[PDB]
Amino acid sequence: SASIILRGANDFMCDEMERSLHDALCVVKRVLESKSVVPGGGAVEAALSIYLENYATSMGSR
């Protein structure tokens, strides 16, 4: 375990930084947990669109 104390300037400034670390922590966490990940942001659907379209011509039979 661990602990992180945030010494900031104003309450409005440090409050947003509190949930900002917890949000980014789960991002790094979830990647390093399921151990095999894949690039997101639409990179999966774009690559499958090109490969499966060339694979369609090698089959036939409707």
Partner 1 sequence: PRQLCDNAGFDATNILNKLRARHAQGGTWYGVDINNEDIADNFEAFVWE
Residue ranges for the known binding site are 41
Number of residues that bind partner 1 (CB under 8 A): 6
Q: Does 55 bind partner 1 (CB under 8 A)?
A: no
Q: Does 19 bind partner 1 (CB under 8 A)?
A: no
The nearer residue to partner 1, 12 or 55, going by C-beta atoms, is: 55
d(CA 16, CA 46): 35
Q: Where are the alpha helices (DSSP H) in 1-62?
A: 11-33, 43-55
Q: Does 50 bind partner 1 (CB under 8 A)?
A: no
d(CA 12, CA 18): 10
